[PDB]
Amino acid sequence: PQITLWKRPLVTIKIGGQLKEALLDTGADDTVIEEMSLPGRWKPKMIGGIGGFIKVRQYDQIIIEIAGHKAIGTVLVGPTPVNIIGRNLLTQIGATLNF
Amino acid sequence: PQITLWKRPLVTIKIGGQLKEALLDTGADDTVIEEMSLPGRWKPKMIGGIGGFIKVRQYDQIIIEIAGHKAIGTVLVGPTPVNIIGRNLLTQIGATLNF
Ligand SMILES: COc1ccc(S(=O)(=O)N(CC(C)C)C[C@@H](O)[C@H](C[C@]23C[C@H]4C[C@H](C[C@H](C4)C2)C3)NC(=O)O[C@H]2CO[C@H]3OCC[C@H]32)cc1
Ligand SMILES: [Cl-]
Ligand SMILES: [Cl-]
Ligand code: NA
């Protein structure tokens, strides 16, 4: 699809068996999902943006479905009010910025 | 241009006669730049990032070139980890997300 930026670029994703809405975010290096359980081992990480840093759990090799396209990669889980699909998974679905 | 997301989508901007590097950020509603001097009056704005809320200076109707495309719009000045070009100016340069 071609997604305009007049509004936030929100799509439906499926992760951990759950359907969620998420933001396609080219400024996020990594994908960050609101608090949820995922299977497998994890390790702590700090990520920073406007306002400073938050602590998240890093899960590797997690599959997501993003607007109908399957991808696999690292997912960070932590206290965010909005699910963020970051570059590590945007690349896998062939997303590009065009102008 | 068509910009893939394997690396950060960094571009050169021109604002205040000066060249700076900025990140094209579809998850930002607003454009936020690090401390610099801009002409005219400013207004207060609170914006919320991943780490919490910060006060910024809002300057309206600022001329800015982004990857060679001309925009005239609102620029927020404050402590950001990187200069970010948000949707208010991405729309002016005709950017879309495609996959
Ligand atoms: C290492 O991997 C990551 C490291 C950092 C982030 S980040 O969420 O902090 N951020 C990085 C960027 C600031 C360099 C991504 C941004 O797109 C962030 C994305 C957010 C995702 C989620 C919803 C909302 C607030 C917050 C939580 C940040 C936008 N947007 C943002 O801060 O926008 C501000 C400027 O415009 C305004 O409009 C939106 C908030 C404000 C994500 C993954
Ligand atoms: Cl990854
Ligand atoms: Cl590619
Ligand atoms: Na894992």
TrEMBL record, chains A, B:
<dbReference type="InterPro" id="IPR021109">
    <property type="entry name" value="Peptidase_aspartic_dom_sf"/>
</dbReference>
<dbReference type="InterPro" id="IPR001995">
    <property type="entry name" value="Peptidase_A2_cat"/>
</dbReference>
<keyword id="KW-0064">Aspartyl protease</keyword>
<dbReference type="GO" id="GO:0004190">
    <property type="term" value="F:aspartic-type endopeptidase activity"/>
</dbReference>
<dbReference type="InterPro" id="IPR034170">
    <property type="entry name" value="Retropepsin-like_cat_dom"/>
</dbReference>
<keyword id="KW-0645">Protease</keyword>
<dbReference type="Pfam" id="PF00077">
    <property type="entry name" value="RVP"/>
</dbReference>
<protein>
    <submittedName>
        <fullName>Protease</fullName>
    </submittedName>
</protein>
<dbReference type="InterPro" id="IPR001969">
    <property type="entry name" value="Aspartic_peptidase_AS"/>
</dbReference>
<dbReference type="GO" id="GO:0072494">
    <property type="term" value="C:host multivesicular body"/>
</dbReference>
<feature type="domain" description="Peptidase A2">
    <location>
        <begin position="20"/>
        <end position="89"/>
    </location>
</feature>
<dbReference type="InterPro" id="IPR018061">
    <property type="entry name" value="Retropepsins"/>
</dbReference>
<dbReference type="GO" id="GO:0055036">
    <property type="term" value="C:virion membrane"/>
</dbReference>
<keyword id="KW-0378">Hydrolase</keyword>
<keyword id="KW-1039">Host endosome</keyword>
<dbReference type="GO" id="GO:0006508">
    <property type="term" value="P:proteolysis"/>
</dbReference>
